[PDB]
From a paper:
RanBP3 is a Ran-interacting protein with diverse roles in nuclear transport. Specifically, RanBP3 enhances the rate of NES export by increasing the affinity of CRM1 for RanGTP, thereby stabilizing the ternary CRM1/Ran/cargo complex in the nucleus. RanBP3 belongs to a class of Ran-binding proteins characterized by one or more Ran-binding domains (RBDs) of approximately 120 residues. As expected, the RanBP3 RBD adopts a pleckstrin homology fold, composed of 7 anti-parallel β-strands and a C-terminal α-helix.
We therefore pursued the structure of the RBD in its unbound form. We solved the structure at 1.61 Å resolution using experimental phases obtained from a platinum derivative, and at 2.1 Å in a second crystal form by molecular replacement. Crystal forms 1 and 2 contain two and four molecules per asymmetric unit, respectively, and aligning these structures reveals variations in the N- and C-terminal residues and in several loops, reflecting the inherent flexibility of these regions. The strands define a continuous sheet with simple up-down topology, forming an imperfect β barrel that juxtaposes strands 4 and 6 and extrudes strand 5. The C-terminal helix caps the barrel, packing against strands 1, 2, 5 and 6.
Numbering used by the authors: 330 to 411, 414 to 453
The structure:
Amino acid sequence: ESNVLQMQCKLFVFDKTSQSWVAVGRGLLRLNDMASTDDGTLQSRLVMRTQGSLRLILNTKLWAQMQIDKASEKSIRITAMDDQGVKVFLISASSKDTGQLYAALHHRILALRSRVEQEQEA
């Protein structure tokens, strides 16, 4: 793996019961790339650990069907796969980090989508 970016941020999960964001808390978020040594094909993931205690609170692989929306100047709404699992989460950060994260995710997802439509959608 190669680290693409690292940023301080705050993570929220969407709670279907209360129909509201539930704050998980702050941590260091990394976007990591891993290129296949056979196809050069790219897989990427978002990994986040709490500050201080370094406990894992996010480890989500990027997929073509993942949707990313800039929910505000300082936040990004993301979907994920995989029950009782949380489907939607929110990353809040500085305006600058949010912009960088959005751009990085956008291009990776766009690449994945291009690949899927060529491979699986004729």
